[PDB]
Amino acid sequence: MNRLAKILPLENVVIDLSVTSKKRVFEQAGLIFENQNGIARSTVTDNLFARERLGSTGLGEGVAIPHGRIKGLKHPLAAFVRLAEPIPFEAPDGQPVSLLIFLLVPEQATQAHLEILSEIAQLLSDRDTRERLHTEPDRDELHRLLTQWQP
Amino acid sequence: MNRLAKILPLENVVIDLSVTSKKRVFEQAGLIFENQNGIARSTVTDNLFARERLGSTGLGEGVAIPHGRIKGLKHPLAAFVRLAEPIPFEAPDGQPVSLLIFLLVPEQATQAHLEILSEIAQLLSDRDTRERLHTEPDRDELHRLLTQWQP
Numbered sequence: 685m686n687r688l689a690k691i692l693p694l695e696n697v698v699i700d701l702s703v704t705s706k707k708r709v710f711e712q713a714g715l716i717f718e719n720q721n722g723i724a725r726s727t728v729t730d731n732l733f734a735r736e737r738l739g740s741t742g743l744g745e746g747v748a749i750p751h752g753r754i755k756g757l758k759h760p761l762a763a764f765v766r767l768a769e770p771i772p773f774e775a776p777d778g779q780p781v782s783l784l785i786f787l788l789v790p791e792q793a794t795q796a797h798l799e800i801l802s803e804i805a806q807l808l809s810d811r812d813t814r815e816r817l818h819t820e821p822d823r824d825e826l827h828r829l830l831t832q833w834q835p
Numbered sequence: 836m837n838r839l840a841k842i843l844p845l846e847n848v849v850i851d852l853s854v855t856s857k858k859r860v861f862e863q864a865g866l867i868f869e870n871q872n873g874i875a876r877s878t879v880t881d882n883l884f885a886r887e888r889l890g891s892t893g894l895g896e897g898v899a900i901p902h903g904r905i906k907g908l909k910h911p912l913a914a915f916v917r918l919a920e921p922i923p924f925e926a927p928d929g930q931p932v933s934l935l936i937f938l939l940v941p942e943q944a945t946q947a948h949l950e951i952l953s954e955i956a957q958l959l960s961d962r963d964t965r966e967r968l969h970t971e972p973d974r975d976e977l978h979r980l981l982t983q984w985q986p
Contacts, residue, residue: 739985741953741957742957743956743957743960743961744957744960744961744962749953751949751953753946776957776960776961776963776964777961777962777963789949791946793944793945793946793948793949794944795904795942795944797944797948797949798902798940798944798948798949798952801949801952801953802892802900802902802952802953802956805894805953805956805957805960806892806893806894806895806927806956809894809895809927809956809960810894810895810927810928811895811928812927812928813927834890
């Protein structure tokens with residue numbers, strides 16, 4: 685498997701986003717999912733905060749995994765965003781965040797939910813990879829790498 | 836919340852374990868859970884491999900989060916193990932593993948499962964913390980720190 689393969693489409697790889705707030709990214713993250721899925725952009729952003737205010741999803745070193753539950757979702761959804769300027773994110777190490785991969789899951793929990801979030805974490809966590817994502821300009825290549833880590 | 840608080844008791848903080856195989860730790864991890872829970876030590880170790888051979892749960896830099904599903908479990912269970920000598924674990928970065936926190940969850944998935952694995956990941960992932968765990972000798976203090984990260 686590739687596991688991020690079937691839920692993170694190319695549409696959902698967003699390169700460089702000039703943006704200022706934690707709210708700002710969450711709003712844009714809302715627009716992304718709203719595009720390839722029916723889902724209201726507002727419900728995504730509200731729900732991400734309904735998790736982020738509960739404690740930062742920053743993983744350390746510019747990396748974050750904001751995620752949440754969605755009311756009507758039928759299968760989980762993911763995105764990836766880079767930022768022009770790293771934003772203050774209240775990360776564990778105090779550093780600003782510029783790389784982040786978003787995960788939404790349905791209310792109804794799957795055994796897979798754990799293993800998909802864990803794959804994401806492990807991916808962002810490794811710094812050999814963390815650098816490749818921080819530098820790559822080709823969008824096709826940032827998708828291939830994301831959805832083909834451990835194949 | 837503290838979140839690792841209610842599932843990772845002091846019993847389940849094991850300091851320094853002279854051991855050689857990935858199988859060896861998994862066997863000992865099996866004995867730990869077998870102690871504070873009814874569960875057969877064998878079923879834990881078998882099940883962890885039934886996940887580890889599916890891809891390494893090493894998170895990078897001596898850190899691993901081996902985990903699995905258990906047939907009769909009523910609430911999730913966790914442990915923490917340090918190793919005398921870091922063992923070859925097939926981690927993403929090629930480094931041997933000496934720190935690892937084990938997670939078992941019931942077959943029946945909860946929304947919480949994701950957020951509890953994610954808390955563990957974020958904790959091990961941050962290297963300011965990673966060092967404190969790698970050095971601390973007092974077992975009481977290694978429990979307090981584990982179960983009180985973001986309180």
